[PDB]
Structure formats: C-alpha cells, structure tokens
Amino acid sequence: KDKEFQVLFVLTILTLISGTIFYSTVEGLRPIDALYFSVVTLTTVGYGDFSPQTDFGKIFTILYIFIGIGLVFGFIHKLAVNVQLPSILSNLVPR
C-alpha cells in the first residue's frame, strides 16, 4: 500500500509538473503561479484568478482536466485512507 501510494504520488507530481511547464510557457505564468493554477484546476476548486487566455491554453485545459481529475482524486483518496486515517487512529492510543 506504500507502493500503491507511491505510484499515485509520483504520477500526481508528474501531472502537476506538466501543467506548470505548459501554463508557464504558453500562458506566461510564473512557475509558482502555474503550479498553483494547476492544483486549483485539477482539484476543481477553480478560483479563477489565473484562467487561460489563449485558445491553445483553453484547449489544453479541457484535456488536462479530463486526464487529470481522475488521477488527482485517486491520490487524495489513497492519502486519506492509507496515510491520514491510520495516523489519526494512532494518536488515540499512548504507546
């Protein structure tokens, strides 16, 4: 399960890296703004302070959402079930 977590951890990192590079280059965002935008899109929060302005950006964002949501929320679920939950359970007991 640490190796199920590890795979989706890595995939998530690669996915956010892809969006950092694309949105920094094509749409002109700072590396940090691209990452932050990528995270806020794939988690569907979607604040809208940085939306894409070019048609290639609009198109890319359509695909990135469809390819990216399933992966991101799979990581979030494994994180919550396999990491967050046990550590909570462990706090409820003194060793």
Binding site residues, K ion, CB under 5 A: 44, 46, 48
Q: How far apart are CA 32 and CA 71, in angstroms?
A: 21
Q: Pick from 6, 32, 86, 90 the residue near a copy of itself by CB under 8 A.
A: 32
Q: How far apart are CA 26 and CA 18, in angstroms?
A: 12
Task: Say how many residues touch a copy of itself, by CB under 8 A.
Answer: 37
How near is the Cβ of 45 to a copy of itself at its closest, in Å?
4
Burial 16-49 (b: 16+ CB within 10 A, else e): beebbebbbeebebeeebbbbbbeebbeeeeeee
Rule CB under 8 A: is residue 33 a binding residue for a copy of itself? yes
Which residues inside 12-31 make contact with a copy of itself, applying CB under 8 A?
none
Q: Pick from 6, 25, 44, 90 the residue near a copy of itself by CB under 8 A.
A: 44
